[PDB]
Each structure stands twice: as structure tokens, then as C-alpha cells.
């Protein structure tokens, strides 16, 4: 066991190994940047807020730890370390996770640099590559947005989840469909891509219903083929009295853009989730001809998420979370 030191950072107590120094808050869990003396690199340390307060908190803590231990891909957040000051299961109450610090989020980059077409190919390529991996573990992000995309000075990107969101959300989620295929994530990529291309938020909705209104103005009101799959009688009625609205031709909307980028956006921003391109299919799209390597777009090992169906006691989730802290093995 290492030697821990304590310190208070903005009305929070932080107890971490001496390994990590120069902690400075960046987020509120809450997150500090820090300097990892063992490598010389900068890290982000997340301290879980109240990890075992309820059964539901306890399950989310275990969820995040299990997920982060599983993710081993260049374009997805990965765990460098996980630690607790606690000397035993009965003492266990705090959880800290450590990852490589990337210097900026994509939101930051989009505001005072107009990206070139080459930049858009590389940034979206990477989000797709990391998504192919996440999806191959039967995980859905569900909140992909520029603030969840950490980017370095070489514009290398990783997907994470800090935890409006609305501007990037698939319309089925905002109408609580409850099913949700993984292409809800592809909807988000289409919104991100549009905004990388134009400099402007695609669907800057003011609230929940304005969000859907703006979405339908671009993509059109549901076509017969979509309406045929709608099981809920209310939904169909809720839909049939919004404005009878045409799909816009995206070629007309994203004026200056590479026609291959317009094509790909048409294949992402389809209302019917069944007809949206998959991350794997997208990686093969000619827009990414300069980046695609089918031998280097890997998939995840199988991910057991049977815990998701289980209704356990706090201390059960807590001993499970403790087990995973102990079995952690750092990357090379
Ligand atoms: C991208 C992917 C793989 C779908 C993630 C899911 C979650 C997650 O927690 N879950 C998302 C799904 N929903 C929930 O129930 C929570 C679990 C992540 N968690 C984090 O990205 N955590 C962190 C965020 C910001 C800073 C960090 C610094 C060091 C370590 C981790 C950090 S990333
Ligand atoms: C008024 C706005 C209408 C939004 C229509 C969203 C339809 C999304 O697409 C649907 O998603 C489901 C997965 O959630 C699938 O089961 C359906 O088969 C598919 O058609």
C-alpha cells in the first residue's frame, strides 16, 4: 500500500497517494488535474461523490468502475489507476479513479478555431472508431456531446462521460421511446459533425419541445414507413398534428461542405433509428478514406453486464465495488 496525503480543495477533502501532486480542481463526483510523479505525465483524478448513499448510487459507482476497467481503446477514456484510502471493506467509503489528462474538450476547440475539412475527417473518424469499440461491448453512450470529447494538441480524441445535453440527443430519447438502439449515438455524431463543419450548433433548442421542433424542420415529419412501426397509439396521434413538414436536402443546408461529408450526415441524421448508419459502416464511408484502416479499428472483449438486471443491497454493491478496486491491474 502507498502513502496517502490529505488536502482540502474547495470545501472537499482529497486523500490520494503521494504519487499524485499539484491537485487543482477542474470539475464538480469532482475532478482534479494532477501531476503523476511516477510517469511525469498529467492526470485527471475523479473523486466519486457519495458513492454508496443509496442502492441506486451504489450501483452507479459499481457501473462506472466496471465500465472503466473494461475500456482499453485509444479513442475511449481508460483507467490508469483506481484507489481508495480505506484499509478494509468495513472502512471503504471513498473511490478515486485516475486517467491520462487531455488538455481540452471539443467544445473549447470549436469556439475559436474554424476547422478544416481534414480536421473534421480526423475528429469524427476518431469518435466513430471509439464508438465502434464501445458499441461492440453492447454499451450505449446516450449522452455524446462536444463536452464529453477530450482532445489533445495533436487533435487525438477520446470519448468520456462527465455525467445543453439536449442539443445532441436523439429524438427517440426525448420522446422516451425506451428501446433505443446504439444509433442514438450516431444521431449525436451527426449533430457534432454538422457543428464541426459549420461552426454553429445544429439544433440549438431552447427547451425540450423547441428541440424536437428544430429537429423536424431539418429532417421532416415522420414518413409512412416510420409511422408504420409506431406501436403506441398516443405517439402516433401526438405526431400527426405537428406541421406536415418536408425533409430538407442537406446539400442545400450545408452549403460549402465536402459532398462526401453531406452524404454521411444524411446517413446519420435519419429520424428512423433503424436506417441510421452504424459506427462500423461509417468507418468504411469514403469521407474517411485517408484515415480508415480496417486492421486498426478494434472491438472490445466481451463485457458481462449481467449486474444491470440485479437488485442488490448497498453493502453487496459495496463489496463488489471493493472487489474490483483490489483486482485492478494498471496498463503497461
Ligand atoms: C464513454 C463511456 C465508456 C460510455 C463511459 C461511461 C462512463 C460512466 O461513468 N458511466 C456512464 C453511464 N451512466 C452511468 O450510470 C454512470 C456510468 C464514463 N465515466 C467517465 O468518463 N468518468 C470520468 C469522467 C470525467 C473525468 C474522469 C477522470 C478520471 C476518471 C474517470 C472520469 S466513460
Ligand atoms: C416526432 C418525432 C418522431 C421521432 C421518431 C423516432 C423513431 C426512432 O426510430 C425507431 O427507434 C426504435 C428504437 O428506439 C426502433 O425500435 C424503431 O423500430 C425505429 O423505427
Swiss-Prot record:
Regulation: Activated by cell stresses such as DNA damage, heat shock, osmotic shock, anisomycin and sodium arsenite, as well as pro-inflammatory stimuli such as bacterial lipopolysaccharide (LPS) and interleukin-1.
Reaction catalysis annotation: L-seryl-[protein] + ATP = O-phospho-L-seryl-[protein] + ADP + H(+); L-threonyl-[protein] + ATP = O-phospho-L-threonyl-[protein] + ADP + H(+)
Keywords on record: Acetylation, Apoptosis, ATP-binding, Cytoplasm, Kinase, Nucleotide-binding, Nucleus, Phosphoprotein, Serine/threonine-protein kinase, Stress response, Transcription, Transcription regulation, Transferase, Ubl conjugation
Pfam name, any one: Pkinase
Annotated positions binding ATP: 26-31, 46
Lineage: Eukaryota, Metazoa, Chordata, Craniata, Vertebrata
Free-text description of this protein's post-translational modifications in UniProt: Dual phosphorylation can also be mediated by TAB1-mediated autophosphorylation. TCR engagement in T-cells also leads to Tyr-303 phosphorylation by ZAP70. Dephosphorylated and inactivated by DUPS1, DUSP10 and DUSP16. PPM1D also mediates dephosphorylation and inactivation of MAPK14. Acetylated at Lys-46 and Lys-145 by KAT2B and EP300. Acetylation at Lys-46 increases the affinity for ATP and enhances kinase activity. Lys-46 and Lys-145 are deacetylated by HDAC3.
Domain Protein kinase: 20-288
Entry annotation: catalytic residues: 161
GO molecular function terms noted in the UniProt entry: ATP binding; kinase activity; MAP kinase activity; mitogen-activated protein kinase p38 binding; NFAT protein binding; protein kinase activity; protein phosphatase binding; protein serine kinase activity
Protein name: Mitogen-activated protein kinase 14
UniProt source species: Mus musculus (Mouse)
Modified residues (N6-acetyllysine): 46, 145
Amino acid at each position: 500500500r502507498p502513502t496517502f496525503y490529505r488536502q482540502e480543495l474547495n470545501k472537499t477533502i482529497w486523500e490520494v497517494p503521494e504519487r499524485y501532486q499539484n491537485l487543482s480542481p477542474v470539475g464538480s463526483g469532482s475532478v482534479c488535474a494532477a501531476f503523476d510523479t511516477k510517469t511525469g505525465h498529467r492526470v485527471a483524478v475523479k473523486k466519486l461523490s457519495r458513492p454508496f448513499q443509496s442502492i441506486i448510487h451504489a450501483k452507479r459507482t459499481y457501473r462506472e468502475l466496471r465500465l472503466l476497467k473494461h475500456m482499453k481503446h485509444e479513442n475511449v477514456i481508460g483507467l490508469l489507476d483506481v484507489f481508495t484510502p480505506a484499509r478494509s471493506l468495513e472502512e471503504f467509503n471513498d473511490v478515486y479513479l485516475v486517467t491520462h489528462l487531455m488538455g481540452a474538450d471539443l467544445n473549447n476547440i470549436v469556439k475559436c478555431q474554424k476547422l478544416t475539412d481534414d480536421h473534421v475527417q480526423f475528429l469524427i473518424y476518431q469518435i466513430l472508431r471509439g464508438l465502434k469499440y464501445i458499441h461492440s461491448a453492447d454499451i450505449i453512450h446516450r449522452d455524446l456531446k462536444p463536452s464529453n470529447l477530450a482532445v489533445n494538441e495533436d487533435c487525438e480524441l477520446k470519448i468520456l462521460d462527465f455525467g445543453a445535453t439536449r442539443w445532441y440527443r436523439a429524438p427517440e430519447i426525448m420522446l422516451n421511446w425506451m428501446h433505443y438502439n446504439q444509433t442514438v449515438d450516431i444521431w449525436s455524431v451527426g449533430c457534432i459533425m454538422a457543428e464541426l463543419l459549420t461552426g454553429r450548433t445544429l439544433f440549438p433548442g431552447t427547451d425540450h419541445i423547441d428541440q424536437l421542433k428544430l429537429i423536424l424542420r431539418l429532417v421532416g415529419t415522420p414518413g409512412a414507413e416510420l409511422l408504420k412501426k409506431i406501436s403506441s397509439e398516443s405517439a402516433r396521434n401526438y405526431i400527426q398534428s405537428l406541421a406536415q413538414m418536408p425533409k430538407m436536402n442537406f446539400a442545400n443546408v450545408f452549403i460549402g461542405a465536402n459532398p462526401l461529408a453531406v452524404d454521411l450526415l444524411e446517413k446519420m441524421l435519419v429520424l428512423d433509428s433503424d436506417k441510421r448508419i452504424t459506427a462500423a459502416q461509417a468507418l468504411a464511408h469514403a469521407y474517411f478514406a485517408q484515415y480508415h484502416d480496417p486492421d486498426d479499428e478494434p472491438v472490445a472483449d466481451p463485457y458481462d453486464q449481467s449486474f444491470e438486471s440485479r437488485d442488490l443491497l448497498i453493502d453487496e454493491w459495496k463489496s463488489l465495488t471493493y472487489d474490483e478496486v483490489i483486482s485492478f491491474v494498471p496498463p503497461p
